[PDB]
């Protein structure tokens, strides 16, 4: 109920990320190539201990992010030095064993985090440096408010932890700095499309291609090099009932929402 995220090397990192997916989600032989499979997730919370921002030293170790299994929501960050869990305002009733709670003035949406931190994910840079820096501003936060400094740092950790956990394409592009990542627009679209991909993907049956919104996959291998983990369809991140369904035509699988919008 607590996994580690060792940012030592690009290997230590991916290796850990694999530990958690393997641990919280089972595969789908329906989507498999080269011995990699798409894993579908399947409620509660669990800690993730951040570790390895400067492996030589080994000093920056009292960060622990509390994560929600079913949707991979990052409900907030615990401060192992004083055991105070600072939860986002939308998780004001969430709690973690062994800690006191203190409620932040902003919720976890990117809308807000981006508002406050005053930065946009598209183009956001991330390296060992900023991550070290980002660890200190969190560690030194005492208080209620969700400040610009906790904002920018949560944008970063939420990215290399939950975004990278869900997407093989963001881990891969980020892994490298560990051995400065620029978060492309293409990586942003993906994050925005987690719930519609998860509603469709299970319908994958060997179609030439898959298209959900502003995202397309040209083959099974492209589905794999980008998406590692999906929802199984704490508000849900899945789209509602009867609505999004994949519709196949001419060996192309679509999400019914996007075809409905482009056909009028």
């Amino acid at each position: 109920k607590e996994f580690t995220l060792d940012f030592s090397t690009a290997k230590t990192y991916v290796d850990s990320l694999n530990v958690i997916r393997s641990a919280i989600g089972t595969p789908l032989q329906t989507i498999s190539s080269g011995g990699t499979s798409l894993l579908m997730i399947d409620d509660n919370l669990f800690a993730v201990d951040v570790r390895g921002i400067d492996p030589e030293e080994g000093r920056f170790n009292n960060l622990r992010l509390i994560v929600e299994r079913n949707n991979l929501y990052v409900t907030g960050f615990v401060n192992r030095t004083n055991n105070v869990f600072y939860r986002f305002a939308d998780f004001s009733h969430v709690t973690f064993p062994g800690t006191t709670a203190v409620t932040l003035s902003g919720d976890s949406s990117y809308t807000t985090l981006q508002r406050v931190a005053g930065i946009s994910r598209t183009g956001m840079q991330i390296n060992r440096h900023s991550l070290t820096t980002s660890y200190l501003d969190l560690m030194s936060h005492s208080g209620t408010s969700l400040t610009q400094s906790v904002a920018r740092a949560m944008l970063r950790f939420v990215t290399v932890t939950a975004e990278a956990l869900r997407f093989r394409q963001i881990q891969r592009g980020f892994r490298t700095t560990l051995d400065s990542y620029v978060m492309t627009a293409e990586d942003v679209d993906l994050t925005l499309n987690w719930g519609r991909l998860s509603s469709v993907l299970p319908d994958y049956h060997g179609q030439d291609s898959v298209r959900v919104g502003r995202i397309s996959f040209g083959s099974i291998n492209a589905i794999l090099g980008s998406v590692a983990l999906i929802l199984n369809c704490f508000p849900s991140m899945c789209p509602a009932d009867g609505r999004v369904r994949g519709i196949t035509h001419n060996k192309i699988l679509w999400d019914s929402s996007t075809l409905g919008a482009i056909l009028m």
């Binding site: 009867g242 369904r245 409905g260």
Partner: protein, 69 residues
């Protein structure tokens, strides 16, 4: 106009007289506005819940107001 029926779109019907027919619920109303024809089919396709508004709130009743939800 008041609400009449509300629900998902059962089936739509292009008619001989160029009108369009929708079956939302137990009711089966129709409309004579051309712009609605596209809107109504994407609503049907994607699964929205639409609410029809009319005083002809009965079968064969006519309509011009809609709420796409």
């Amino acid at each position: 106009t008041p609400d009449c029926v509300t629900g998902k779109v059962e089936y739509t019907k292009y008619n001989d007289d160029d009108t369009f027919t929708v079956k939302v619920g137990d009711k089966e109303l129709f409309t004579n506005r051309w712009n609605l024809q596209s809107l109504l089919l994407s609503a049907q396709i994607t699964g929205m819940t639409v609410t029809i508004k009319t005083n002809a709130c009965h079968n064969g009743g006519g309509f011009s107001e809609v709420i796409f939800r």
